[PDB]
Point group: D2
Chain length 342, copies 4
């Protein structure tokens, strides 16, 4: 029927490889013709196992050489602004993973380049908005079935088994810290659910569970309490040392009923009875938890390019969530309350 979109991908790591698989196997109206990474094994895997034509170690070279309509940026956070700016100037439609970046000026310039190319689609990586459970809860809230929102609590905690791959991820490039890396999703959800902005942050951090993270300037746990512009209160917890699995939980406490999303991170529909009692095995990664969400958001992006429609989640939503996460980290660093400026 219609000519499929020609696409390229930067990054083939923890999330990169999942996006690449979906891009080849699951996404309609797209052909992944080029891949870029600094790891030679990942590039060989992209070529031989996935059937991607051309591989690159230089992303600028790829954009300069390849005939592509859209690009997927799944490289580390510090590279996001420069990679996006380069692709936007080349005339490309951009899907960039969260966060937008780390430096405020680098993000602002990125935002300026995006706004100057309105004919090109820019989409961020807040996948939890596409997840069926979060949507279902949002629909309940929008219906008035829990009254007015009083309080929201967000958990985002990786399991102990993920300490090796996170360390590599954080050693090789700045992640922005626990609040920026873990809590940013929850920050967007709170903004989405309430329609309000945080005006004050109290952040506390911890290395009790993993003291060796101090060596690389990381905190194992980040706990933040937020005050919103409308009176709603919030707690955010990011962590890396859960024993059961990947905990991703959102609690929305209303004036007339509550909802809890992902109270237990159940793997499947199987209840196990053993010498421990009654067990529910848990999901061990964010990727297995949000696999469908990752697929649906990317399909949405491809559809956005074809139709010529910008995503509901704006650049400003990415900036605001980043500034808030930074504020929580600032609060912990300085040991003071931080009034959020947006």
């Amino acid at each position: 029927t219609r000519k499929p979109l020609r696409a390229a991908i930067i990054g083939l790591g923890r999330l990169g490889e999942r996006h690449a698989r979906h891009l080849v196997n699951k996404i309609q109206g797209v052909k992944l013709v080029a891949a870029c990474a600094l790891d030679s094994n990942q590039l060989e895997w992209a070529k031989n196992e996935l059937g991607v034509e051309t591989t690159y170690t230089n992303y600028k070279d790829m954009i300069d050489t390849e005939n592509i309509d859209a690009i997927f940026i799944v490289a580390p956070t510090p590279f996001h602004p420069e990679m996006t700016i380069y692709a936007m100037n080349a005339g490309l439609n951009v899907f960039c993973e969260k966060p937008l970046g780390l430096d405020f000026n680098e993000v602002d310039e990125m935002a300026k380049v995006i706004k100057s190319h309105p004919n090109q689609i820019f989409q961020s990586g807040f996948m939890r908005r596409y997840d069926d459970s979060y949507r279902y809860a949002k629909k309940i809230v929008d219906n008035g079935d829990i009254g007015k929102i009083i309080y929201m609590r967000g958990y985002g905690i990786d399991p102990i088994s993920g300490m090796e791959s996170f360390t590599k991820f954080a050693t090789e490039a700045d992640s922005g810290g626990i609040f920026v890396d873990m809590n940013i999703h929850d920050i967007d959800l709170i903004r989405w659910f309430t329609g309000q902005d945080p005006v004050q942050a109290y952040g506390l951090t911890s290395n009790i569970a993993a003291p060796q993270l101090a060596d690389i300037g990381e905190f194992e746990t980040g706990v933040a309490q937020l005050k919103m512009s409308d009176g709603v209160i919030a707690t955010l917890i990011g962590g890396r040392h859960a024993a059961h699995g990947n905990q991703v939980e959102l609690e929305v406490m209303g004036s007339n009923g509550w909802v809890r999303i992902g109270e237990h991170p159940d793997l499947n529909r199987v209840t196990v009875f053993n010498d421990q009692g009654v067990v529910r095995p848990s999901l061990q990664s964010f990727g297995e938890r949000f696999d469908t969400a990752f697929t649906d958001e990317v399909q949405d992006f491809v559809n956005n390019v074809i139709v010529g429609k910008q995503p509901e989640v704006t650049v400003d939503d990415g900036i605001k969530a980043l500034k808030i996460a930074k504020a929580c980290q600032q609060s912990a660093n300085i040991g003071k309350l931080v009034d959020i400026q947006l």
Copy 2:
């Protein structure tokens, strides 16, 4: 204020010791004066730990020597009829544990002796009727909150840790088989909930989990299906080899809703997170599960003796439950459907 009832107990085993503890510590308007057991150490325990005045190895000696208003028979099932008859004839009020007996001839004579002493209270031991949860579900059903009952499922499975204490219990005396020992409780519950009687039984037995039980003529598992007098269908499962704990479960499946009682045998209100996932520790015995019900039923008996009122659960209820149980056992042994007449 008023003279307490003077009571005695026969048997201080798995259930006897719990009854004796409640009788000294929890039950009001009663004083445990004497105890009878064949175990010397159990009798010493009654004197030294509980403060019981006198001890006996012969129950007839105790009944003919002690000044008592009431007796508690927690001796093995075969001794129930002869102990009840002797105690009834001595003017005593009798609380006898379930079941009434094993031989239909012995139980008939026992029932006749109880009928001939209408001024003396007799009470069986179907404690589940006193349990808070079963009562709650019975109220739900009676209010019509599940519509009309169509199906019921009763599970009564001991944990693997109880295998040693059961073998002791079943080698020293005839327990009456798995359907009589385990499933009798659910039979009573089904009769209670429906107001109907079973007309047909299909029973099947298993020694897969423990083949050594055949050496004492016992079956590890007994599964029975029942046709009720007004349409209802029921399944009963008695077992002795669960890994998680003591499973005691009742499902009432209606035309406009269901209820499940004790779907999981949760020990307490603690949820555990470990390398297994999300865990709920389980109850390990019938005595821990039904501790309150055991207390409440004995208190009801004591009140019944004082006020001069026969309990709701009649002798007829015990006979029928025993008959239906033995019909399930017969069905399994003869490999045929058994039509029940009550």
Copy 3:
């Protein structure tokens, strides 16, 4: 080179299968569609881009250039459609059950057996379900010891009653055991590696007394004796208030597993005046959607690679004979010995 495929039937499950074929399945193109409904065919042509539509399935097989056919028409037509396609060289995916008439199913199996270069696959999708596979891996590893007892539930929500009544008046459903429990029967055989030797069936119409007029039963409860000493219970029903209950309990000598104990819709827990609430799934389609996609993908891959599926025609016959033995037991009011 993608497979050229046709579909017969665009109903409750037919529309779902056709969607997957177009949107999710790799190595295939849905070239043609056949149904008796004009609206369903227009939906297939407009919304799914199906090139050609037919009311006559035989005319479709004889006109279209196709490699595979998906049979999602009513059960009675399964044998003759499978037979016609097999004799025309096609690869066949046929939905459960194989059929109702034992002779037609034997004739059906004969046509399958005489075309060994052609793939035939049935629709036991629960074997592809992530949860069932997980439990099957647990049992195989010896994590629950030996199986002693299994319990299978298949109960539809009240909302489906008015839908089912209209269908069961005009057509033969095969009965409550055949319709609601055949999946559970296959699962028991799969998990145990053994066959039922005896069956006790009971039926009920307490929840829907109006079904007695159309020779149907609202509830069927069956107790089964396995060849190795394992005991099973099957329940089929049509009057659950909470939603679609599909449950398997596998009781072992050293551990139990339960599959779909509660038919949880998603990961949202609700707190309201009723207490603490988990919303439930309302149809088999929503529950086993991924399974429906995976089995169909498996079939496509089987045709391409030229490999017959694990589940045989014999598996489909046996599960049907077992289900019918349960219905017979209830109807004659007697124990039925199975072989």
Copy 4:
């Protein structure tokens, strides 16, 4: 030989303590009762068999032959009722909290210390609860590793709003943190062995704007920095739809425990048009009935043997200070340092 006992207060909790004293507690006789309500006093004399009833507690103490007294009167009377009883050479069980005014509690604590032959026990019943003790056992054994974070919830159902509104118009509750989270603070102090050094509190009246008219807050949320690096959250509330939520999460370095994640009424699972439902507890009393019994039994035992309870007066004072810091933090819109 039983201890002769009296009770002051027969309201929401007093009525419960009185019943346990008569029906369940061993080694104690409830001889006298004092309240400002005729109906309550008459209920004590008729349904419980209490000999003498009073409307003045001073008259009761000065007349009755008693060894112990239970103070379940309103909080403003706690300091003066304890001092009056301690001076009378009496063993005192006093409900939470010790008081609302720091000067009155300071004087109260000084009197308690000067009578060391008399037992003083407070009302932190959660330390007697089976579930909290089981979780405390896990934490102590090192079965969750090192504590990193803890979260305490105490939320009353909407049904309880009416009785609270009329009460808080009449008397000072001490604020949402003092009234709803004091148990949780003690629990955190008990589980960690550490003390908070800093508090950030925020309040809300979104659910009940009418409470701002009487200087009350419907919801309070606090974050606490503990002295050795542990982080904690406290939430008190009065507008839950499902029932009484009382929950404690202990997040560790190698495992977590959650106590009372759902406030389950019993062991019954309900299946209806809304899905799978667990009915919830509606009050703190029904949730902690056994805890109330066991602590009062422990007090009686303490008086018999002559052993002071593990929970000290400094525990009740510290917990109160911490809760007040949370309230103050919200009221002034600033962080509060705690010493």
